[PDB]
Amino acid sequence: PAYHSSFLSLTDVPTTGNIAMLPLKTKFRGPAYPADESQMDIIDECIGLFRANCFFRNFEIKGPADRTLIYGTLFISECLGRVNGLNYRDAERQLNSLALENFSIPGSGFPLNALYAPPLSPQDAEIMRTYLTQFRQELAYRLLSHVYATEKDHPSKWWTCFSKRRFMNKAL
Amino acid sequence: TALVCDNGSGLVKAGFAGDDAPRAVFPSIVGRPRHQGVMVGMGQKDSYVGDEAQSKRGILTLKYPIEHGIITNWDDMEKIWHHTFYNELRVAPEEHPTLLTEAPLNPKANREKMTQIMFETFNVPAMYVAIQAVLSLYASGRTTGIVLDSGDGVTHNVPIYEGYALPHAIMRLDLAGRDLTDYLMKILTERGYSFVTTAEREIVRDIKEKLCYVALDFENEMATAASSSSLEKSYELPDGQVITIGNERFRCPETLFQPSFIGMESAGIHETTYNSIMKCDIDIRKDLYANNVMSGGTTMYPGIADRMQKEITALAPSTMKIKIIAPPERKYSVWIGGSILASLSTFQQMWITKQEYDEAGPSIVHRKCF
Amino acid sequence: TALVCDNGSGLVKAGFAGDDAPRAVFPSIVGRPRHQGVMVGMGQKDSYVGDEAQSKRGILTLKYPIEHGIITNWDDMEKIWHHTFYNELRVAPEEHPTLLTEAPLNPKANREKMTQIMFETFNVPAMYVAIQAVLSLYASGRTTGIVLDSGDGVTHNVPIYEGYALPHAIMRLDLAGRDLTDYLMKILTERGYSFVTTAEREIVRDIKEKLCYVALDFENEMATAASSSSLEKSYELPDGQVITIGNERFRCPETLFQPSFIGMESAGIHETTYNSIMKCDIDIRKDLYANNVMSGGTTMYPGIADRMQKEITALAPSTMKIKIIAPPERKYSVWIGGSILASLSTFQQMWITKQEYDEAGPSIVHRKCF
Amino acid sequence: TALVCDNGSGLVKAGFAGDDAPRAVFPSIVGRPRHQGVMVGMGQKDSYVGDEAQSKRGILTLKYPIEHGIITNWDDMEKIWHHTFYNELRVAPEEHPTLLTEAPLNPKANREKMTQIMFETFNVPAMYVAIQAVLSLYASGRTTGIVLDSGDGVTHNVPIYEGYALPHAIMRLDLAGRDLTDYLMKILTERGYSFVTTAEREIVRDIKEKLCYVALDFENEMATAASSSSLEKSYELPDGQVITIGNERFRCPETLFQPSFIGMESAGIHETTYNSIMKCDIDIRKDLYANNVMSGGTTMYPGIADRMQKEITALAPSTMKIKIIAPPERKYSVWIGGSILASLSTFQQMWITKQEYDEAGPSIVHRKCF
């Protein structure tokens, strides 16, 4: 079967709607708790699993950690749509602009509004947005270290080929 | 926190990003004493700025370090910027990324010297220079329109449509509040009054700020002033004597519609706004006539938006609806726009950083800002 | 059901097999911004398609990826096909067979890249490429006739007798509505009005679509307009200024009957139709004359069916009834007849399938779509 | 003898037939005083013309009555023709037939009013209106060529082969000497030099005619000028103060190759020439590429012919010679061609006589001239 988040084995994790606000290694501002710099976190997992997971056409969600891994998986498919033909520097500015621009959260054009819960209060919506903006800025910045690993002025074709591999036939 | 400084020709307006109005608003002025000062030991100093220089205007000589939107004295400009950070905002500039304002069609060296002073002398984290017209459109909360800004030193038109400026249709007129102060100071001589000192310039500016208005039909205001006293109004000088002002009260602002009053050949603000719309592409003109955004203190006269609507209705074809958008916050709509722009989440990757000014030098501002 | 996509030179016309009319109809245009994008955010895009390009056009360079019925830009044609499926029809193309169309006597590579992009980009389950004039004959309720189809980029004549096409008698003429729009720009310049940009070319296309018509006798109409105000009438631009035109209303369409007005050395659409009938075998000509079928937007002029009948009656022998079939829905007859064909049960065996493309490559189209 | 009068958008060029160069060459300007004129006996007059307006330019406002090759002010144009005949040539129009000039793709009301004024106001015996670029090919000593003509108001391409013009392949661009002057006034502001009056437009035109040149490799000249060097050069204004300019010398005419510098959506003069050749019949293209003819003063920048030859060589296929003809007299080649055409012993049937103007009215000119 497909690969699920190792962070589904975590417990008492902070949550919004039914996203898990998992420990995150990042330098962007936002609510996410600093992870250990020495260990894999959900973004090292999400990019490491993405290019296997985007081929499967069946996925059963174990909890809020997988709902977070899925939102990341769908956003990596958006990034690999945005990145094509760019220099590494143009790609960093384009994919940060993509990460920052106004997006639908669950409970609002959201593609998976049946599998994700609406925000639990008018204040839960703001913590869900301020988490998802920080997460997807880090997710964009981290992906670029892989697609521009060997060369710096053109995205690796070994990553651009997943740009049409629409995970579970869903997209943001 | 980011700083926003609207670096005006007649007033400095300054504050933080996300504040709804400037924290500081003061004369863009530096001055030196013109008298012996023989009673030494009462805290005298060699030069003064802003409200202090304005309050002592009789014993001072007053200079503006900006002329027509161009910094003409860079030592006096850094003395004003030091005073914005340390006296008015009361912050360290090396902790605050700073947004700056400029007119379009300025000397390239003005923007470069404004850049190197910020990094070399105020040690700023990051900086940006915005063309002050698009800030007036951010304060107006719209994607489309022709901005008319008329400040102290310059008047300019900028067409924007759906977020895109038309830089060929942009045009500037080197006539605004300073030139109207010079012309009022001239025509009050026709009634036998005299104003020549740099203090008396500020007394005539302080008159212009409150007595003057724009005629809706200039020849009718002239003919009614030639047959009644009802258009005359009166003012008291700081010396205590009283003056009366008549057709001079609208003949001053009429210079914006007839620049030949000061010997200029150039088109009036209605004619230049229309010619800037006509220089734009045929499909956008409809939405420019629907969005003439007024900005800056020379747009604050009573009746000017009604006159501008009358005049642009005469120049445009009769089938279509023209409106002038002239908010109460006209004086600050540039700074308010800078407050909005500096607060946008997508703007935070557009700041020109010290850590890229380092290898590129002062020419970084032309490649990074606009 | 199956999609029918009549991706013509000027309009994309799209919908579902068995529907009464196309439910997606939009300009075959990609637009890209030609100006300084100064405001950050603002909902801006790298390019715009169809009605979004047509409504933003004052800031866009507009270009059609298809000219003379041939795809000149495949990257923008994929952008248009994406807009048909995902934005305009709101379908998964991997769920639906697609009937595509093209004009006869096209390059072989056009059919190949069109089948390749449908199977490899849009992942379609099945597709077919029909000749546009053969589709237009199903929309007539006929199985014999000669179809004169004229779109934006190409005019063609296809004679069919009892379901057999006569491919030696097929005529193509690379003159249709875009050449008439370019000629209307060239002659509007003589009355005082210059239209120059790709955006202004859409204004003069809209003038052509509601002011222009075909004269029954050109030299009498030309003399009637030269001697009276009665043929003259007016149009209002987006800018609210008014255009008046006279003989330009029938001089533009007369280029279909007199191609030398645009410098072409070819027979007009009437004589090209007669030359196609005269290339057919002698027994079939009587039934072709009684069944001249008009199609495409360039046949929508007032008076063109009356003119076409007058002109063919002078070429044919007087001993027989010439009949021109010009339905009011002939604006869409290629699409209408594609929706008939795509709903027939034998046609369900005629599709190129995914499995069959994967085994054979894009050359499969040349040995299955005729 | 016959008069020849090239009605340029920027200069009148006039003389008799068969003379080697124009007798009269002066600005196509009317000037009017813009000041009170208090001094009695100063010799002031209601309006000024040509070099009399140019030598008074400090006290006048200067109007060109031709915009883009179209007369926009007929009262000031007949004042220019009156000055031409009675002051500059010093002859009676009643005794001399007149050859006049007009750009192609031009409002036919211009040609009608122009012929009406010669028969009604000057009572000229006979006249003609030649196409501007067809005269330049007579001066070139040729009967095959594509003529790139660029004056003060209009740039156009006329392809002609064996004495036949291809009017469908004629192309017109409303970008020439004034558009480049106005762009030079725009970019001179980047140094802080301000030019805004109509007299200052003449000073910037007088700079353009000797400081500007065409870069062969524009982006390499932009890189070369960044290292300050002999690329930057000086000019002295009428007031005795001096200006220095660098890349402004070649950004100036680069607008001919990049019309997007002034916000136009059009091909440069190289792509416009190539599009006109590619619109001609396939057999004549080789002889047009070998006979590419330059005329009008806006073709007189140093390096323009060398850059045009480089650009057309990159657009066209490499197998055949591409030759550009740029005579040292190309400033006057239209008037020279008129001096030939009015002199040719086989042209005298082609003049419009007063006797047939009195039968038909001014619409006679459309039957004789094209």
Ligand SMILES: Nc1ncnc2c1ncn2[C@@H]1O[C@H](COP(=O)(O)OP(=O)(O)O)[C@@H](O)[C@H]1O
């Ligand atoms: N109410 C007013 N009526 C007339 N002139 C005004 C008014 N308010 C301000 N001004 C004038 O406009 C200028 C100040 O406006 P401002 O927009 O701040 O100019 P700037 O930004 O260029 O310094 C000064 O010349 C001032 O005298």
Ligand SMILES: Nc1ncnc2c1ncn2[C@@H]1O[C@H](COP(=O)(O)OP(=O)(O)O)[C@@H](O)[C@H]1O
């Ligand atoms: N009422 C009309 N009168 C004249 N021309 C028309 C009319 N309606 C459409 N056209 C022209 O027909 C062309 C579009 O026709 P269409 O059949 O859709 O062409 P295509 O299939 O090749 O894209 C355009 O040139 C358009 O201006």
Ligand SMILES: Nc1ncnc2c1ncn2[C@@H]1O[C@H](COP(=O)(O)OP(=O)(O)O)[C@@H](O)[C@H]1O
């Ligand atoms: N030496 C020159 N170098 C560059 N440009 C020139 C020169 N002499 C004249 N011009 C150009 O020619 C224009 C003058 O008009 P002209 O060539 O006579 O055209 P027209 O016939 O339309 O009046 C000038 O404004 C300038 O653009």
Ligand SMILES: [Mg+2]
């Ligand atoms: Mg200001």
Ligand SMILES: [Mg+2]
């Ligand atoms: Mg078509």
Ligand SMILES: [Mg+2]
């Ligand atoms: Mg000329």
